RNA sequence: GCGUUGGCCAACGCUU
RNA sequence: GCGUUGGCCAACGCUU
């Protein structure tokens, strides 16, 4: 098990969104044994990026079992996180060890009435990727959540003039009914980033929007896993 | 906000 | 003249 480390040594200076630092977060992206050690910056939304390898257990055996959900979550990462230098990416959190809870949650793969209503917790948009449910129809679309506005609901006036209102826009255009008139809105950025990183409207709905198991913080800690592993591999 | 073609500037690379 | 990233306008397409 080697760490996977990140800090920003340069974040972004106020000449232009605010800022998502990967060391606020505990759980970061770390590499298995069975490996040799190689030796010892990418560029993101976030600023500059600075990266460290570490060593944290040499010389462990983990079970055939836990090996294949290693296995398994780092297939994952690169086929659903990601879509196109070492063994399993995986997890990481309290950097110690190994997260098999984080695994098996994200291993374990919508009925709304006026008599069966739609409640809105909003721990559950802060640190989040979202998607519409309404248009999965081709490659489903991931979103941060940018913010959250308080002071809109989904009768608010549409930022469009065809439509007055956001449950108006998704009853005419997607038939879509919403159980919660209350809820607030999300401002959403898209989760579709540069592959080489090495170099240096958008309201939805909550009731209309499912939740990523990869909280958004994660993901774009994940953006930088390819432009780290170009030259580790090399 | 994205995409796309389309000009109008920046910057290093080719090219001359 | 080309290429490339990078902003700054045009235009239809998505999206909201």
Not at 17 to 44: H, N, S, W
Not at 97 to 104: A, P, R, S, V
Not at 182 to 208: G, W
């Amino acid at each position: 098990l080697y760490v996977i480390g990140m800090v920003l040594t340069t974040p972004l200076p106020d000449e232009l969104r605010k800022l998502y630092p990967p060391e606020d977060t505990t759980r970061c992206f770390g590499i298995l044994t069975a490996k040799p050690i190689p030796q010892i910056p990418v560029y993101t939304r976030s600023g500059e990026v600075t990266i460290s390898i570490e060593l944290k257990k040499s010389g462990f055996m983990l079970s055939l079992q836990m090996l294949e959900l290693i296995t398994r979550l780092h297939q994952y990462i690169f086929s659903h996180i990601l879509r196109l230098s070492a063994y399993c990416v995986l997890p990481l959190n309290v950097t110690l060890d190994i997260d098999f809870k984080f695994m098996e949650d994200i291993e374990k793969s919508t009925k709304y009435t006026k008599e069966t209503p739609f409640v809105f917790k909003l721990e559950d948009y802060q640190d989040a990727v979202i998607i519409p449910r309404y248009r999965n129809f081709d490659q489903p679309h991931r979103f941060y959540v940018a913010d959250v506005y308080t002071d809109l609901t989904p009768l608010s006036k549409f930022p469009s003039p065809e439509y007055e209102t956001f449950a108006e826009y998704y009853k005419t255009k997607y038939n879509l009914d919403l159980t919660n008139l209350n809820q607030p809105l999300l401002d959403v950025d898209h989760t579709s980033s540069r592959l080489n990183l090495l170099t240096p409207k958008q309201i939805l709905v909550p009731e209309l929007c499912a939740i990523h198991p990869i909280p958004a913080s994660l993901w774009r800690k994940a953006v930088c896993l390819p432009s780290i592993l170009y030259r580790l591999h090399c």
